[PDB]
Amino acid sequence: KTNVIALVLSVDEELMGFTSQMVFGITEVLSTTQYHLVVTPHIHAKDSMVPIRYILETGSADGVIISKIEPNDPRVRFMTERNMPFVTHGRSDMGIEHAFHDFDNEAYAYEAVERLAQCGRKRIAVIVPPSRFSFHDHARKGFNRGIRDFGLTEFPIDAVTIETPLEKIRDFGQRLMQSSDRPDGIVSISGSSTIALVAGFEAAGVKIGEDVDIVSKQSAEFLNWIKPQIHTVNEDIKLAGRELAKALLARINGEAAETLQSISGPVWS
Numbered sequence: 001k002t003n004v005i006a007l008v009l010s011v012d013e014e015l016m017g018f019t020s021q022m023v024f025g026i027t028e029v030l031s032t033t034q035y036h037l038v039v040t041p042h043i044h045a046k047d048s049m050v051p052i053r054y055i056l057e058t059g060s061a062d063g064v065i066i067s068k069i070e071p072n073d074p075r076v077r078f079m080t081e082r083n084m085p086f087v088t089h090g091r092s093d094m095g096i097e098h099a100f101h102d103f104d105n106e107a108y109a110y111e112a113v114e115r116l117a118q119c120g121r122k123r124i125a126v127i128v129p130p131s132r133f134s135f136h137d138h139a140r141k142g143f144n145r146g147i148r149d150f151g152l153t154e155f156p157i158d159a160v161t162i163e164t165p166l167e168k169i170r171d172f173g174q175r176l177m178q179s180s181d182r183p184d185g186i187v188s189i190s191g192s193s194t195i196a197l198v199a200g201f202e203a204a205g206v207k208i209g210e211d212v213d214i215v216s217k218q219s220a221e222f223l224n225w226i227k228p229q230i231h232t233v234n235e236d237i238k239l240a241g242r243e244l245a246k247a248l249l250a251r252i253n254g255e256a257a258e259t260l261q262s263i264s265g266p267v268w269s
Contacts, residue, residue, distance in 0.1 A: 006061035015192040016220040025241020099260035106142035112215040113146025121185035125155040155183035162190035173200025
């Protein structure tokens with residue numbers, strides 16, 4: 001009716017062009033269509049319902065893409081109640097079937113511990129999203145299973161997440177390698193975070209690949225350039241964009257959500 005697709009994604013400090021690749025992928029799918037893409041950002045987490053209210057009260061879009069999905073997500077419920085077609089980048093757990101595309105963060109976290117185990121590492125720390133997101137739980141599940149399956153121990157970290165400012169993450173990283181009790185392995189769920197942490201580690205005297213190994217996700221090729229000694233897994237965010245756009249269009253045409261669900265796995269560099 002309006003020919004607008006809305007993308008609502010929170011603005012994070014991010015160093016790999018997530019937004020660009022996501023937008024690129026969406027527009028690939030929309031390019032042969034009459035649809036315009038509009039992005040509606042919010043800066044704070046607490047403000048995550050704000051773009052949804054505007055879109056729905058004004059109904060200026062025909063469909064909505066959202067991300068950073070909680071297990072009990074009020075936006076999923078909100079748009080489900082008002083019959084606004086949507087697709088999620090991520091998953092919920094609330095008894096509502098919807099279209100989605102997600103990355104397998106459980107498999108990633110699990111394979112990350114495995115790699116670190118093959119590297120001879122014994123005490124693994126993990127850097128995760130805030131606990132309120134579904135992908136935190138996926139990652140924490142894969143991580144738990146890896147620690148156990150490979151008989152290692154977790155070096156615990158409650159001071160940072162992947163949404164902590166990169167400079168504070170740099171501080172923490174350095175602060176962390178300057179104790180006697182420190183991890184010899186890191187699993188990170190964010191390349192942007194990894195970069196900052198790697199900096200702190202070095203400003204603390206740590207060689208990477210020798211004194212500590214690190215597995216990280218990456219959405220862009222830029223890590224293997226910076227430090228090729230980091231073990232990397234690729235998340236395809238352009239592919240996420242395309243899939244989300246495909247699924248949202250099909251939903252707008254009334255197709256069943258249950259047929260519009262997909263999951264992409266880790267691809268080692």
